[PDB]
Structure formats: structure tokens, C-alpha cells
């Protein structure tokens, strides 16, 4: 068994074709300086075959993605070069031998070991997180292996930096496969959901939520608006940020008036007008006296259409106009009206079901507390004209004086509590949210700064969900204010009849002693009278020294304690 | 005797024979056995020869099937795609013989051991094993037409990063579509289809719902989008012409952009060939002036002439009696000065508005070009709220009669008061604020149409809202209301005290039934302010 026989069958374990035969390449004679170097030579070719399972095995099933074919066809360049060698190692068999060949194949036994070693750490891989476990063989400092990898590195992520520059200016991902880390759902809300596990480790875990948003922001600018049109990638990921984005708004400003609607939903919704909700309650008087029963909504819309042309809510743009209209709740006719400004569309992505849930649940508070004042204007205004006709009976003005003194004492919790909810809820949470937007963009800088608008009112106002004992505190002052309105009018009306009927005793004859008794017992019921005004006063005192020490429990409501407690009438 | 001979040189005998095998010819020692095609070598040969052999091989058999496609596929049962494919997979296999050339010179010299030539062909095992994919996956499921060029353009995005195979499938695509995008610009420029065999995405047949239709199989698959705008572009050069360059790129869309520079112009030659000539604006204004009654001065004649011979019953008035009234009613009114005033005639219907009276109504004529817009369809919606209109006129015509009879027992001037009072609110509120203001509509949404199957829109969308805000669509409570009216007229007619009043309670009862339902809703709410102004009614 001569040398230049091993020689002859080496030049073919070197690609797996088998004295020596197939885990080492075991050869079966010949001298022991001699099977030592082809057993050390031949473990070429089984590092040849392992690669070439791989790229073979994996050749064959169409379901490993689109990456993983840029993968299995770049470890061809890479042996194409391999098969060069072996073409110019076989012309000289015709001189070389085992210890000359050791120096010819020294550096291929090196890349047909880093390259039969990349393939089994990328084993079950597929898609993008193939691109990233060919990644984490770079950081490995040796000159050699970091500049082949960083090679392979550069075919395997032109796959994946097609999808990017596919779902980035285009918006439009197709992969039968799922290889990108966007996955869609057959608009905002649902439907684009970050993949965590095919995200390639090269893009940090930041730069992915700007191409989801990038995506997302040219998707939704085609279907629902309704339009149509390293250090250098991470410039690019910025620069198609800062554009797609600021376009998104002017589109959104332009052809649906996103921000013409918030300043309109805060004059009507949130009875920032003034103007108008003040016509409105004086025309829907007779109507919601009536129990809910009698009520139906298709008589109080022209009402409101009557408002809307008498007061100053007329000149006003005619779109959000047409989406201004009732609803009704499901008793009193108080208790069931209320607006509702209905938005669908584009539009309805910044509100979200959610926020005309809340705008609502405001929207009674803002009520209650707008009749409770209409209320004690009334009676207020009542008593300027009750003292200007029975100014004549001196004996009335004992008990009619706590009527007055109990009103003076009752308007002021009211007529404060409005102040606090315009200073220090509206006018002060709202520009925190005007602030927010003429210098925010994106689109979602303007939702996350509406939204929280919407938690700090909910949390100013008492209408939290740990608050509950302040606001039934809260309504049993709101329903003080409805019995005095109620033992007034008795007291205002009998003594009208007494002082009508001592008009017409008079007047017809200029009997004188049967009516000394029927003047004597009303001078009698007078004290009666003043025992419910004594009583009355004396508990609506004590459910108004007992809220404030509920306030003193989260921090604005110092502020209420302070316009209630002024002059330190209260606390002794 | 491969098995007596040495064994450094019998190489050299197989890479003689493995180079004739590569042309498709048989060898000496490598022969081919009778048909995927699978070859046998030798019983007795080198183990470490045969094992190398048979890695080949596999660019033998992946010829001998594509030489077999391109022998075949050429026939003229299969398409104008299936030809050029057939082509364009042709040029190849010639590239392939001169690969095969040159190595036949190169080993006369004896260079070419058998070991260089498993280096040579490398790229020629890579490109003939595509070739021989796609012929495999255009008869595995029969594809002709456009379903053999969708193929070819999902077999060429698959390969997205392999680029020494996509370079290749974006050859044969580009040239397997050049004749199928030859009867594309017949069909966008012009509107002849020739199409000899059944593959266009878009077939002619023997009212124009029908004659041209999107086949759904021979659709291209990146044509998808555009799939109907190639259709309504040359549909609307027929309904002209009757009367009176495109390349393909991957990842440019240089032809998407080019049909709509013609589709934009393909409806921009057909729109304003219906306004300008035989025009149409000044087209349904002729319908208005009768269909809508909005010519005072024509009816006003028409009933005053035809009126005993409308009481008649039905199938006892002769039309040549009617159509010579309606003619003399519309030369001696003002509807003189109407150009085409001749296309009204008679149209008795059989049934009533679910006789002789009631069964009384307009048909209109007309051509063939404008018969798109204005069709059977969508007139007889024209002559369903026309009927409505004629019924509310002619009872207070009538009511208006009686009028003057009782002026020269006392009780029924309150009465008759109450229902002129309504249908004299009916019919101002059924002209004035719901015909009269959509249509202004109608006249100024059609000077910004951009193509007639917007105007064909345009247009039911304007009866689909006439017939909607009236009380067209149930709502029978009218009816009924309407005949206690009428039929207090034929009382009145016969010059009782008893009977006056028995209207009352009956005509009074049936209109709270109207206002109890117009006012249950979501205009349909402005009704019922026209009903009642006074605060009446308040009940």
C-alpha cells in the first residue's frame, strides 16, 4: 500500500465519497506514520458532510421561510470556493503528499469548522430569529471567523431589511410565512401586535416599536382616513418617523377638524357655553317635571333645536352640529335627560366607546349641580318679590327673616362649589391638555394626553371609585336644597291667601267678630311654622360641618375646603 | 470492460461518457433506462467513482425533463403564454449545449479529469433544477393564460434573496407576459379583444351586464388590484366607438401607474359624450316638467279635458281616445316650447298603487345611449311616485270643486276646512322639501361626475330618497285616510245632517293614527309642524 494510494483516496473523503471508509473516517497493511495523517486529514470530509445535510435536508421542505433560503443558499458560495480547491489539489496528483498537504488544507479546516459549527447553534430556527442566532457568532474578536461571519450575516438580513423597507413606506406586509415580527389579525387598538421572539438581535428593542408605528401610521392612513399617496438605518427608521407622523396629523386636522371637535365637545358636553345651557333648562322646565313615563325623545329635539338657533350656539360650524343630539337614559324627567354627541368614523379612534363613557358620567355631575343652582336663583328671586307685597304684616316678618337667613346660608355652598368646578377642574385640567397638544404629535402624544384629561376630572370631581363615601356625603346637601324649596312655597302661598282674603274683607264693605278668630288662630299657626325652619336649619348645618371633615382624608380637594370654609364661618 | 481496466484511467473513459449524457444522447456505460428519467451505470466499477457518478447525474435527468417541456408545450391547444414560456425556457437550453461544447474541447487535451468536472457544471445542476420546477408546477395543476403567469410571480418571490435564482424567474416572467400584455393594450386603447384561445381575463358575449365579464381563474394575481378598472375602462369605449406601451418590472410599478392614465381618460371621452351631445342634463328636465308635475299649466288642462272619460271602468276606454288629449293638451299649454315633449305616451297599469282612474299613468321613451342612465329599471320608479302625486292632485281638485256648488246644511264648511287644510300641507311639503331641494341636488352632484357609473349613481341615489322621505315606504294608514276624503266629496255631490258628522269621527280618528306613527322615528319630524301650526291636533 503505497503513499500515493492514500493520497489518491483522501482527495475524496474530502467531499464523503470513501482503504479509507466511513464517526470517525476509519482506515483499514500500511506503517502507523501513515494512518496517524489521514485520520487527521480525513476529519475535513465529516465536517464536509455535516454542511452539507444541512443545506441538502433543509433544501427539500418548503415551510423554512425566506430567510432561511438566503442562509441554505449562501453556504453554496461558500462551498463552490471548496470545490475549487478540490479541483486544483487533484490536477497535481498526477507531486504532493500527506505532510505536504497538511500546509494546503490548514485554513479550509478552520471555515469548514466555524461554518459546520454555525449550522447546529441555528438549528430549529426559522424567519428573523434565524438572522439573530447568525448574529451571536460575531462577537468573537478573531479576525478571521468575525470577518466571514459578518458576511454571511450580510445575505441572511437581506430578507429581513425587505419586509422593513416593505411595511415602512409601503404598509403593506405579505409573508405566507411568519417571519416578521409585525403580526397582523385578519384598527389601532388590535390587529398589529409586536412578535417578541422573531425580533433580530441587531435592532434594539426600542427601534421595533418605531416601525410598528411607522406601519401602522400609513395602514390606517389608506383604509379608514381615506388617502392615498449602523448609523444611516437608524437615521432612516427617524426620518420616515418624523414625517409619516406629522402628515398623519394634518390629514387628521384638515379633512375631519380632530382638534375643532374637542373645543367643541367641552362647550356643549361639558356645558362650557354657558350661553346655551342656560336657554336649555328653561325651556326643558315643563317638560321634565313630568315623570319619565309621558317622555319620549322625539318631542325634546326641537327643543334643543329651538336653543341652538336662539342663543349664541347658532353661528357655529354646521358639522359638529349634526351630531349634537339627545339621548335618553334608562323616575323624573330630570333624572333621565342628557346629551350624548355621538362621533363615528376616523374620529372615533381618539374616543374610543370609553371616552363618551366618561364625558356621560361627568355629564350628571355637571347636571345636578347646574339645577341645584337654577334652583336657589329661583327662590332667590322668589323672596324680592315676596317682601314687595306683604311687607304690611309685622307679625310675618319674625318667621319669614329665617326663610331668608337659610337661603343666604344655602346659595353660598352652592355658588362656591360652581366656582370650584370652573377655576379648578375645567379651567385648570384643560390646560394641561391644550399644553399637551399644540406641541405634541404622533398621534399618540395627543391620545395619551386626552386620555389622562379624562382621570384627573373623573379624580377632581367626586366621581372616583375610593371617593364613594364624599359624594352620597355630597347629595344629601343636594337634597336639602329641594325641602326647603318645598316648606317655602307652603309658606309663601298661605300666607297669600291669608292676605288676599283680608284684601277682599275689606274692600267690599268700606261678621266683624267671627273673623278675630279666624285672624287670632293664624297669628297662632305662625309659631307651628317656625319650629320647621328652626328644625330644618339646625340638621342642614349639621350635614354640612359633617362634609367637610370627609374632606381632610386627593390633594386638589384642599383647595374646596378653603372656598367653603372662607371667613371661617364654620369651625367654630 | 471497465472491470479489467486500470483505475486512474477508466476515469477518463466515464467523463466521456458523463459528457455525452449531459446533451441527452445515451453513452456507452452510462445509459438511460425507459421512463423522473433513472439511469444505470455499471455492475463493476470503482466504488469511489459511481458514488461520485450519481452526483450528476441528477443534470441529466433534470434535461432530460425540460427538452420533454419544451417539445410539447409549443403546440397550439395551450395559449400565446404557454408559447413563449415554452420560448424563453428555449434560449437556455441552448446556452446549455455550449457549456457542453466547450468541455468536449477542453478534454481532447486530456484537462478534464472527472474530479473538474463536478467544479464546471455546478451553475448548469443550479439553473436546470428551476427549469425543471416550473415545468413541473405548470402541469401539475393545468395552467393556461393568466394562471401560468400568476405562477410565475409567486415562483419568483420566493426566491427574494437568493439572486442567482430570481435573476433567472424574472427573466421567464418577463417574457412569458409580453403576449398576454399584447391583447392589453387592445383592450385599454382600443376596445377589441382578439383572444384567439379563451385566456384573456375578459371575455365578450352575444342589457350590457352581460356582454362583457371578469373571468375569475385567468386573473394574473398582481393585476388583482386593478381587476376592474381594466374592465370599466374599454366597456366604455364600445358604448363610443359604436356610436360615433405597457411593459412588466418587479418592485416598479411603471404599468399601475399607465392603466389609469388611461382609465381617466377612458371615462373622460364617454362623461362628456352625454352631456354635450344628446345631453342629458337638459334630458331629465323633460322628465321633471311631468313625471314630478312640474308644469302647472299642462295638467290643469289635461284633467280638465280627460276627466269623464277617466271615471269610466277600466277596459271600456280606447287609448286612441286618451293619447289624442294628451296631444292637444300639450300643444295648447305652455309645455309647447319642450323639444321632447314627444316621447310621452299612455301606460294604463293593471294593478292599482298596492278603476279607470287609479290605473292612469306617464311612459316614457328613449334611446339607446342614454337608455344606460335612464332604464326600465329606474323608471318605473319615476312612474311609482308619480301616481302618489296624481292621486293628491286630483282629489283637491275636485274638493276645490264642490267649493263653489254650496256657495250660492251649515256644519260641514269646518269640516271641509280640515281636510283641504291637510292635503294642500301634503303636497307643499311633498313638492317643496322633498322633491324641489333633492333634486337641486341632483343638478349640481352631476357637474362634478367623474365617470357614468357615478352618475349611475347619482341618480338611484336621488329616487331611493324621493321615495324614502315621502311616505312611499307599511305607512297604508294613508291610503284609507284618502278615501273618506274623496268619498265626502261624492255626499256633497248629491244635492245627510246624520252623516256629516259620521265623517267627522272617521276622518279624524284615521289622521291621529298618521302623526302618532310619523312622530315615533330617530325630514320625517318636520311632517308633522306642516300638519299642524295653530297648536291644533295637540291631543
Redesign the interface.
Known amino acids: 500500500i503505497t503513499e500515493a494510494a492514500l493520497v ?2 483522501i ?2 473523503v474530502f ?1 464523503g ?2 482503504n479509507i471508509k466511513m464517526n470517525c473516517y476509519k482506515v483499514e497493511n500500511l506503517s502507523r506514520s501513515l494512518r496517524d495523517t489521514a485520520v487527521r486529514l480525513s476529519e475535513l470530509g465529516w465536517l464536509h458532510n455535516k454542511i452539507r445535510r444541512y443545506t441538502d435536508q433543509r433544501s427539500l421542505d418548503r415551510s423554512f421561510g ?2 432561511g ?2 442562509f441554505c ?1 449562501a453556504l453554496h458560495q461558500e462551498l ?1 470556493e471548496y ?2 480547491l ?2 486544483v489539489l ?2 497535481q496528483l498526477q507531486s504532493l503528499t500527506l505532510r505536504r498537504l497538511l500546509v494546503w488544507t490548514y485554513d479550509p479546516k478552520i471555515r469548514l469548522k466555524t461554518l459546520a459549527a454555525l449550522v447546529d447553534h441555528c438549528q430549529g430556527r426559522k424567519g428573523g430569529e434565524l438572522a439573530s442566532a447568525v448574529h451571536a457568532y460575531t462577537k468573537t474578536g478573531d479576525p478571521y471567523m468575525r470577518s466571514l461571519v459578518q458576511h454571511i450575516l450580510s ?1 441572511v438580513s ?2 429581513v431589511l ?1 419586509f422593513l423597507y416593505r411595511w415602512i413606506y409601503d404598509g403593506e406586509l405579505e409573508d405566507t410565512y411568519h417571519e416578521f415580527f409585525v403580526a397582523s389579525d385578519p384598527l389601532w387598538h388590535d390587529k398589529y401586535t409586536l412578535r417578541k421572539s422573531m425580533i433580530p438581535s441587531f435592532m434594539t428593542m426600542d427601534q421595533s416599536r418605531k416601525v410598528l408605528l411607522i406601519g401602522k401610521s400609513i395602514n390606517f392612513l389608506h383604509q379608514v382616513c381615506h388617502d392615498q399617496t449602523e448609523n444611516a438605518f437608524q437615521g432612516k427608521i427617524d426620518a420616515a418617523y418624523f414625517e409619516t407622523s406629522k402628515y398623519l396629523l394634518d390629514v387628521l386636522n384638515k379633512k375631519y377638524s380632530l382638534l375643532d371637535h374637542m373645543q367643541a365637545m367641552r362647550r356643549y358636553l361639558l356645558l362650557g357655553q354657558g350661553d346655551f345651557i342656560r336657554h336649555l333648562m328653561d325651556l326643558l322646565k315643563p317638560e321634565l317635571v313630568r315623570p319619565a313615563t309621558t317622555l ?1 325623545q ?2 325634546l ?2 327643543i334643543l333645536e329651538t336653543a341652538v338657533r336662539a342663543t349664541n350656539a347658532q353661528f357655529d360650524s354646521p358639522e359638529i352640529l349634526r351630531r349634537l343630539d339627545v339621548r335618553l337614559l334608562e323616575d323624573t324627567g330630570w333624572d333621565v335627560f342628557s346629551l350624548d354627541y355621538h362621533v363615528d368614523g376616523p374620529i372615533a379612534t381618539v374616543f374610543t366607546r370609553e371616552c363618551m363613557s366618561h364625558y356621560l358620567r361627568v355629564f350628571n355631575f355637571l347636571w345636578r349641580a347646574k339645577r341645584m343652582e337654577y334652583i336657589l336663583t329661583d327662590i332667590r328671586k322668589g323672596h324680592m318679590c315676596n317682601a314687595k307685597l306683604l311687607r304690611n304684616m309685622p307679625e310675618f316678618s319674625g318667621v319669614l327673616h329665617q326663610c331668608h337667613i337659610l337661603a343666604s346660608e344655602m346659595v353660598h355652598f352652592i355658588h362656591q362649589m360652581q366656582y370650584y368646578i370652573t377655576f379648578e377642574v375645567l379651567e385648570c385640567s384643560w390646560d394641561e391638555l391644550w399644553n399637551k397638544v399644540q406641541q405634541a404629535q404622533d398621534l399618540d402624544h395627543i391620545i395619551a394626553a386626552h386620555e389622562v384629561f379624562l382621570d384627573t376630572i373623573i379624580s377632581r370631581c367626586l366621581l372616583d371609585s375610593d371617593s364613594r363615601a364624599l359624594l352620597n356625603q355630597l347629595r344629601a346637601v343636594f337634597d336639602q336644597i329641594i325641602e326647603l324649596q318645598n316648606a317655602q312655597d307652603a309658606i309663601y302661598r298661605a300666607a297669600l291667601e291669608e292676605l288676599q282674603r283680608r284684601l277682599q274683607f275689606e274692600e267690599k264693605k268700606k261678621e266683624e267678630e267671627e273673623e278675630n278668630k279666624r285672624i287670632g288662630e293664624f297669628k297662632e299657626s305662625i309659631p307651628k311654622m317656625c319650629s320647621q325652619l328652626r328644625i330644618l336649619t339646625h340638621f342642614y348645618q349639621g350635614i354640612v360641618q359633617q362634609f367637610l371633615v370627609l374632606l381632610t382624608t386627593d390633594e386638589s380637594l384642599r383647595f374646596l375646603s378653603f372656598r367653603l370654609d372662607f371667613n371661617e364661618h364654620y369651625k367654630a | 470492460l471497465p472491470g479489467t481496466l486500470p483505475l486512474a484511467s477508466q476515469e477518463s473513459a466515464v467523463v466521456e461518457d458523463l459528457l455525452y449524457v449531459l446533451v441527452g444522447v445515451d453513452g456507452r456505460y452510462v445509459s438511460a433506462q425507459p421512463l423522473s428519467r433513472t439511469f444505470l451505470v455499471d455492475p463493476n466499477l470503482d466504488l469511489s467513482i459511481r458514488e461520485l457518478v450519481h452526483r450528476i447525474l441528477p443534470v441529466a435527468a433534470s434535461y432530460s425533463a425540460v427538452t420533454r417541456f419544451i417539445e410539447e408545450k409549443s403546440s397550439f391547444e395551450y395559449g400565446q403564454v404557454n408559447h413563449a414560456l415554452a420560448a424563453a425556457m428555449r434560449t437556455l437550453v441552448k446556452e446549455h449545449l455550449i457549456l457542453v461544447s466547450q468541455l468536449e474541447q477542453l478534454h481532447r487535451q486530456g484537462l478534464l479529469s472527472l474530479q473538474k468536472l463536478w467544479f464546471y457544471i455546478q451553475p448548469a445542476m443550479r439553473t436546470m433544477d428551476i427549469l425543471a420546477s416550473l415545468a413541473t408546477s405548470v402541469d401539475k395543476g393545468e395552467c393556461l393564460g393568466g394562471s401560468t403567469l400568476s405562477l410565475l410571480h409567486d415562483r419568483s418571490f420566493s426566491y427574494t434573496g437568493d439572486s442567482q435564482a430570481q435573476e433567472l424567474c424574472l427573466y421567464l416572467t418577463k417574457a412569458a407576459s409580453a403576449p398576454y400584455f399584447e391583447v392589453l393594450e387592445k383592450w385599454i386603447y382600443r376596445g377589441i379583444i382578439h383572444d384567439p384561445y379563451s385566456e384573456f381575463m375578459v371575455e365578450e358575449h352575444e342589457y350590457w351586464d352581460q356582454r362583457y365579464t371578469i373571468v375569475q381563474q385567468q386573473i394574473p394575481s398582481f393585476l388583482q388590484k386593478m381587476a376592474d378598472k381594466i374592465l370599466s375602462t374599454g366597456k366604455y369605449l364600445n358604448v363610443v366607438r359604436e356610436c360615433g406601451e405597457i411593459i412588466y418590472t418587479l418592485k416598479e410599478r411603471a404599468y399601475v401607474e399607465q392603466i389609469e392614465k388611461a382609465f381617466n381618460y377612458a371615462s373622460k371621452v364617454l362623461l362628456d359624450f352625454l352631456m354635450e351631445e344628446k345631453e342629458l342634463v337638459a334630458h331629465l328636465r323633460s322628465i321633471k316638467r311631468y313625471f314630478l308635475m312640474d308644469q302647472g299649466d299642462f295638467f290643469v288642462h289635461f284633467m280638465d279635458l280627460a276627466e269623464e272619460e277617466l271615471r269610466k271602468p277600466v277596459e271600456d276606454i280606447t287609448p286612441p281616445r286618451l293619447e289624442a288629449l294628451l296631444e292637444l293638451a300639450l300643444r295648447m299649454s305652455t309645455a309647447n316650447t319642450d323639444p321632447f315633449k314627444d316621447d310621452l305616451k299612455i301606460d294604463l297599469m293593471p294593478h292599482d298603487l298596492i278603476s279607470g282612474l287609479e290605473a292612469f299613468s306617464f311612459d316614457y321613451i328613449v334611446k339607446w345611449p342614454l337608455s344606460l342612465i335612464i332604464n326600465r329599471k329606474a323608471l318605473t320608479r319615476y312612474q311609482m311616485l308619480f301616481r302618489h302625486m296624481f292621486y293628491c292632485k286630483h282629489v283637491e281638485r275636485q274638493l276645490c270643486s264642490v267649493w263653489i256648488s254650496n256657495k250660492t246644511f251649515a256644519g260641514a264648511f269646518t269640516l271641509r276646512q280640515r281636510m283641504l287644510n291637510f292635503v294642500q300641507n301634503i303636497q307643499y311639503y311633498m313638492m317643496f322639501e322633498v322633491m324641489e331641494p333633492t333634486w337641486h341636488i341632483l343638478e349640481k352632484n352631476l357637474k362634478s361626475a367623474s365617470n357614468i357609473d357615478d352618475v349611475l349613481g347619482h341618480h338611484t341615489g336621488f329616487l331611493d330618497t324621493c321615495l324614502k322621505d315621502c311616505m312611499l315606504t307599511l305607512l297604508k294608514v294613508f291610503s284609507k285616510l284618502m278615501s273618506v276624503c274623496v268619498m265626502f266629496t261624492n255626499c256633497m255631490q248629491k244635492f245627510f245632517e246624520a252623516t256629516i258628522n259620521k265623517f267627522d269621527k272617521n276622518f279624524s280618528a284615521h289622521l291621529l293614527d298618521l302623526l302618532a306613527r310619523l312622530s315615533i322615528y330617530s325630514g320625517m319630524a318636520s311632517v308633522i309642524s306642516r300638519l299642524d301650526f295653530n297648536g291644533f291636533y295637540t291631543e
Open positions: 489518491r483516496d482527495l475524496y467531499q465519497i470513501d425566506l430567510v433560503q438566503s443558499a463552490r470545490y475549487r478540490l479541483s487533484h490536477s445575505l437581506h430578507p425587505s319620549y322625539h318631542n329635539t326641537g
